[model samples]
Target chain A: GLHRLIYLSCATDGLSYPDLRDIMAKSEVNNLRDGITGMLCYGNGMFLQTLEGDRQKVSETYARILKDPRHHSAEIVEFKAIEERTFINWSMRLVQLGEMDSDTIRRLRLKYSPAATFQPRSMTAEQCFRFLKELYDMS
Target chain B: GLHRLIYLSCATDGLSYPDLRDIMAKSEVNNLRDGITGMLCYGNGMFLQTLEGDRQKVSETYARILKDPRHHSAEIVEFKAIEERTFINWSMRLVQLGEMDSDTIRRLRLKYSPAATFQPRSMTAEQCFRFLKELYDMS
Candidate 1:
């Protein structure tokens, strides 16, 4: 009975690719161990990711991710706290990119960015993780 | 209030017809388990699915699904909050071809064609996903 979506857009100038990769790797390991599933999108100098798992875990992670210096301008785009958990067997996952076509990405970046969508919908939780899956494949 | 948009492009040698069938079957099982309302659409090597329920689980599922071998490329085009659930309590469903039409499909497709749109455009992609999901089975 939990759901959450967190979006982060930060300058990667000080954040080396290895550090970013480390963050992603850690997120993925935690996701698998914690039984969390979600998506992430990264490129250029910005990064966006969604954390999905236990309601408490998601909330906790959101707090931590926002404060972490690895990313600046962290925003919780989807924050729908629902009455259940969509994923029952996953703990955590780090999405490399989000779901959508190139055009959609451009539009999202223009305003709230893709993370905005994830942050808002965290409250409702749904059945589509296309965004996360697409980014995950980049691994 | 919870929504998720997931898209897939399969490799010619990856998922067989039987594999897609298996995923659909399992989806139905989950729908029944969680009283989840969702829509699924599949064609060629592409599939789109949407689910409405607890936000935590929805995103969590998205995160773990990254490990799925059946899909080669996946992404989330839209994730956000709405006033209500588009497909709620209908149980896991498969809209094989076409069953419904969303008001924003055309705009969404134009914005994010996987090859064109590279950003999130809000309700567009998800709307199209739902419409397509219904159509896949209905048509």
Candidate 2:
């Protein structure tokens, strides 16, 4: 069984660089071991992430994420059965804002309202795919 | 007196998301108290950060960062005198990669090889300023 999960969250008050560093580090280790792959975009005290893998594993991972005390307001933007994985290479990839140019960032803000942060209910899985794929390609 | 400091580093092996989170949390508190401001970008196991504040404080902060065990191979891309701060509003801002589009990501790649990740020797402070400013505007 295959699954794709996308969600957004807000970083807890006073979240710092070390906190995020640890999250990315541990996530990559566990994600790789569980055969899960996806991308994470964190900025402005918010998180936008996509997880893809075995149906059971993805849900379990998401469940743990919801309980993490570092962030809150985990809202599922898209989740469903998928025939394939879009982010097939990275166990977990972090998208850094430095990698993107102004025009690209501007267009996203224009379309997404809050801009750099994730807006789950207002976004689509296809859009996520395009966004992550583009970031992956740049990497 | 004002200062701007830019540097790049590779994440320590097995670095996790939790670690990054802690970094962000602590950084925000101290940075705010010290009147320091800047942006941090982490992706593909690399960290790119800029610090601007009182000359002495910025230097002090950079010293501590060099000792951080979370990442290694710290290489300063730019450390110079500046009349003003670029990220005056953010005590410490994380540049989220989620807000970018494919075309902009592509253009960055063309202009800066390995665009998604930091390449200290290859990048300039002007580029970093532009990237942070663009993300700031979207906020």
Candidate 3:
């Protein structure tokens, strides 16, 4: 068994499903055929993704993705080898946090928000889902 | 898309391939390669795995997994919607760290392991792959 954690941010212009398909296809080249899971998040200026699992697979997939021309420039940003895998059911994932309508943003900020403000870490997948679920449920 | 997490801690006894193999087989409730990818990590005498995919599939899979008495305790630590998928071709995945051997852990710690201790993050799938390639070639 193996666990991996990876993070990368890419330019917005580089976004495309085909590019991802190619990157994923290349995953097997590194023995990441299974047990590799993480998420990909994108936005106006940058796209970021995290991956973990399969030592060989995670290592190899990282190399293949960096050389990929899809992103103008990609950076590792953050990666860690954890004793436990946080994401178990995702080989690759993309969460689009594109621009939100002004009212939506305001409501999001005013109605329900993390207790701490000014801290600079992105929203955890859990927090985002809860917020979105509530927002959409109300809608 | 269904995103789910199932967390299990290993028995007091050190983990064994049989233990792993059994869990792998028992957790067969979730379908493989259904855009469901996750991570399994072992640390502090515990094994944790998080999976995400179709809600019904993950739910059913967890329901079965919860019944098995192999694992000492099982819980869903983090269940949330994933923006992008990492593995689009795997059904069941198992990621490990320093379980049977410390080789992968040693390499990760010496070179690619992230600096941030609180939220250990490191090299990307692409970056790590390249590093390993170099690490292997030198030998």
Candidate 4:
């Protein structure tokens, strides 16, 4: 199946670590079972995630996520038909700040900072894809 | 109808932020519904949680936690019968390294340092209670 992906959400408040854990656990198990794959990033109370899988499964999962009580304002950053999965091995990969070196962070922030929504709509497709790919490669 | 609690658990692997989210979400909702309250901390691949509720419920929840597949090597750091809940107002609190300021980090590390195992046999009851108390106050 093809894929349609890339969406982001913001926590209404600073999310407690415990709350983050619960969402990840549920996402990992559920995504694995559903043949979905993606990456997730969190900072400054926002969640930027990219989900890729069967178009139907990806959309269905996103639908449920829109209803999640932990966050609101589900925004479609980008939605396009894709022939292949970008993160075939990951159920849900984590993108953390500590993992990136200062150089990488600076480069990313230079273009996206201040207004860096981490929203695909606010970012170029190449930047979003390349960023996740770099993180995956580094990890 | 009192309470008993503290931290204990070993991860088979490094837990990602998303995993933490999943764990917290499940714990928060379940704890709130059952009137359980407490705090959880994670770092250096160890989990330290303090749960307070009815003695029976706390013990039962602990038993279930022991069976959680994400981590093994369950060690009871501290569990004692108490007359009332110290975290009566909290459903569950989380303390994580990345979320803290450097000063607070240094302060906590200086006193507790590597000796800060939640296992009752290794950690002092006073330190355990005091740590969560300060976190609750600051948070």
Please report the candidate that would top DockQ against the real structure. Answer: 1
Tens digits of per-residue lDDT, candidate 3, B1-139, equal 5454434444546557788777666444445534555555554455555555765455445545544555544432333444664443335555545443466555543565454211122334344333333333332
Model 4: CAPRI class: incorrect
Using TM-score as the yardstick, the better of models 1 and 3 is 1
| Tens digits of lDDT, candidate 4, A88-112 | 7689977765457767765664555
Query: What global local distance difference test value does model 2 have?
Result: 0.72
Ten residues in sequence with the least summed lDDT for candidate 2 chain A: A109-118
Q: Model 3, clash count? A: 49
Error of 3 at B37 (Å): 3.2
True contacts kept of 2: 0.00
Fnat of candidates, each listed? 0.07, 0.00, 0.02, 0.00
> Candidate 3: deviation at residue A109, Å?
23
TM-score of each: 0.43, 0.46, 0.35, 0.46
Give the TM-score, chain B only, in order for the candidates. 0.64, 0.83, 0.56, 0.85
Model 1 per-residue lDDT tens digits across residues B1-139: 3444443433346656687678778777776775556766554346666666654456545544544677644544445655677665456566432222443444434444443332222224545554554443443
Ranking by lDDT: 2, 4, 1, 3
- Candidate 2 lands at a TM-score of 0.46
User: Worst 10-residue stretch by lDDT in candidate 4 chain B?
Assistant: B116-125
lDDT (tens digit, per residue) of candidate 3 on A34-85: 5676665555455546666754455445544544567644433333346776
Clashes of each: 82, 38, 49, 21
Count of backbone collisions within predicted model 1:
82
What value of lDDT does candidate 4 attain over all alpha carbons? 0.66
